[PDB]
């Protein structure tokens, strides 16, 4: 055969991301002395739209503590913040929506977002619209905090990792149908070249493992092994179950 | 009660002297034929003195403490009253409603106001009045 499409996507020629209208990378402020010991105050100047991203962005400007200068950071907007608002960041910040606190300074049940996985990587977890992380316990010895992630899984983080109080704006986005191929076109136009999708059963055997034969079919089962060799991984990759997750078809 | 009296310090809010401090000399709650609104004849400073340390010699000390005054008629709506005061009786008979015509008389009033403000800036009175408002 020939090289198939999911193999072809890794050389990254026409499959790279479309990043022209994007505002910049959205990450937290760099951890330093002021956030490590006290707090610092900035002000949010504008809330803007970012191309290829469901959640809006916030432009929070702070002061440089070693030079007479201003520093502007790009945050992801939590639901409720507005222009002209003060944002406090650091160890001694108060528990208000929009503030940036370490995870060892929040009580149980607190709703945080844009959470660092390691202390100092400036935001990794719960960054899409409508998502959040729930604090579900602490460990004062061993300096660890237990969290629940948006997928349902549980994780244990160092208490020096930071997070922003609140839920990320833009929720309820997928509750609307698209209704139109043109709407899907204009959606993926600002992300990457991955739409439309031809089915593998509609190709020839040179192009795909599922291609060929009269009466379009997959000849064998579609569950692949985990140790397949990268031209074979087409289907359901390492599935532990199949079915409906609902068992009733109607609720 | 009625607090906008002579000797009360205010801040000019708009009109080329915005941000400058001001002493009220003569109030007019009713307003004349000209200026039919409630207004006040005031005196203030356009050029503030600069900071002075131990390092400056006597000539540069004398240069860095000059004061440039102004006199003005200003609406009550364009003033903002403070809680500080000042003693206004030095230049009290020189600022009148006939002074604001015949600009030789305005020069003559400005000289008296300049002398009195420099005398009070000496001997350390009213540092709030002789400091700048940063905005």
């Amino acid at each position: 055969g020939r090289v198939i499409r999911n193999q072809r996507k890794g050389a990254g020629s026409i499959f790279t991301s479309h990043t022209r209208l994007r505002q910049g990378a959205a990450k937290l402020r760099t951890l330093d002395y002021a956030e490590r010991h006290g707090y610092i105050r900035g002000i949010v100047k504008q809330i803007v739209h970012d191309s290829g991203r469901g959640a809006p962005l916030a432009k929070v400007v702070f002061r440089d503590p070693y030079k007479y200068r201003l520093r502007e950071e790009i945050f992801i907007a939590n639901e409720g913040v507005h222009t002209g608002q003060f944002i406090y960041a650091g160890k001694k910040a108060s528990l208000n929506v929009g503030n940036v606190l370490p995870l060892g300074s929040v009580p149980e049940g607190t709703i945080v977002s844009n959470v660092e996985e390691k202390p100092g990587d400036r935001g990794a977890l719960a960054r899409a619209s409508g998502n959040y992380v729930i604090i579900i316990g602490h460990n004062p010895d061993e300096n660890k905090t237990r969290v629940r992630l948006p997928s349902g899984a549980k994780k244990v983080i160092s208490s020096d990792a930071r997070g922003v109080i609140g839920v990320i704006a833009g929720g309820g986005r997928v509750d609307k149908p698209l209704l139109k191929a043109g709407r899907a076109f204009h959606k993926y136009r600002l992300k990457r070249n991955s739409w439309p999708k031809t089915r593998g059963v509609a190709m020839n055997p040179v192009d795909h493992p599922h291609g060929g034969g009269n009466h379009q079919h997959i000849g064998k089962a579609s569950t692949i092994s985990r140790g397949a060799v990268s031209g074979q991984k087409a289907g359901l990759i390492a599935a532990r179950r199949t079915g409906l997750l609902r068992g009733s078809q109607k609720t | 009660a009625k607090f906008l009296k002579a000797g009360k310090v205010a801040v000019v809010v708009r009109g080329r002297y915005a941000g400058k401090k001001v002493v009220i000399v003569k109030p007019h709650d009713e307003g004349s034929k000209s200026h039919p609104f409630g207004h006040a004849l005031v005196a203030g400073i356009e050029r503030y003195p600069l900071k002075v340390t131990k390092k400056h010699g006597a000539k540069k000390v004398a240069k860095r403490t000059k004061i440039k005054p102004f006199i003005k008629v200003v609406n009550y709506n364009h003033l903002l009253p403070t809680r500080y005061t000042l003693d206004v009786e030095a230049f009290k008979s020189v600022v009148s409603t006939e002074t604001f015509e015949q600009p030789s008389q305005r020069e003559e009033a400005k000289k008296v106001v300049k002398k009195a403000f420099e005398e009070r800036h000496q001997a350390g009175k009213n540092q709030w009045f002789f400091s700048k408002l940063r905005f």
């Binding site: 002395y33 002021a34 010991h37 006290g38 707090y39 610092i40 105050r41 440089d64 503590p65 070693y66 030079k67 007479y68 | 002075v52 340390t53 131990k54 000390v61 403490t65 800036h121 000496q122 001997a123 350390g124 540092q127």
Partner: peptide, 29 residues
């Protein structure tokens, strides 16, 4: 003398710009 006025700075943790200190412990040699 009385034209000079003392005004001590608040080098704080969020108040003023920090002064120049001896950073010889943190030089990238």
């Amino acid at each position: 003398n009385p034209l000079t006025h003392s005004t001590p700075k608040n080098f704080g943790i969020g108040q003023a710009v920090q002064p120049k200190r001896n950073l010889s412990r943190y030089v990238k040699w």
